Amino acid sequence: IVEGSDAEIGMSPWQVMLFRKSPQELLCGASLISDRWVLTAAHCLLYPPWDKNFTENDLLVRIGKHSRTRYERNIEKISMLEKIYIHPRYNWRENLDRDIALMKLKKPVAFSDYIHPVCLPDRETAASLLQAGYKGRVTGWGNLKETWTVGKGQPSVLQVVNLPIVERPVCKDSTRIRITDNMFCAGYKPDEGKRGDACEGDSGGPFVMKSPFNNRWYQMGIVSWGEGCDRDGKYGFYTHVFRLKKWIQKVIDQFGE
């Protein structure tokens, strides 16, 4: 994420790495919405246009991640996706609509001080925070600056950032893409005079808010797209983890826990 601060030990035990096994690399961030279930950004895994397309087989999932580099020995978790699940109405062709996906950790992940779920919004929670200027914080390992590459490449540790939902009207006019009442835009604006943005490979990463009600941590989004990274004039775009809360639901009780 552009213009951020580096996270802390435990500040996000739900962050999960989207680690293709080979090219032994990284392509996303996902979150722990269970003991054994994971969700993410659509495109993270199904993208024809760039012959993007995967399978449980291809990739491997990691947890307990402070450093993006090393092999966090006795803190990190690593499981294999038992099955993936895309949103049968996904749009790789249109505007990354329902940009959402989930992955039944093939086996069950036991929690600890670095791995602890996020909770799915309830229309109230979904209703109390989801709104103008009400900051929300994005996490991640992505690209420190607009598309390029220890240096302005990528961080050693997990970058944390916080941002203000934007005005739907304005959301819809920093772009030219048909945007859906399923997607929301985060990010400080121009004069607002501050910076912060999620960037390359930040995707499928969370937009969890703090519910002042039960002070519980709740994931309002799934990082989807944007036009660059921190450019005076537009904001990223995220997924209403809720509109689609229907689904997330529907398929977890059809194939898992």
């Binding site: 495109h43 760039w50 990354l96 992505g142 598309t147 390029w148 943005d197 999620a198 960037c199 390359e200 930040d202 995707s203 990082v223 797209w225 944007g226 036009e227 660059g228 990274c229 990223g236």
Partner: peptide
């Protein structure tokens, strides 16, 4: 697309 950039990675 992705935040990245139509055209792939850089």
């Amino acid at each position: 697309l992705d935040p990245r950039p139509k055209y792939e990675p850089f």
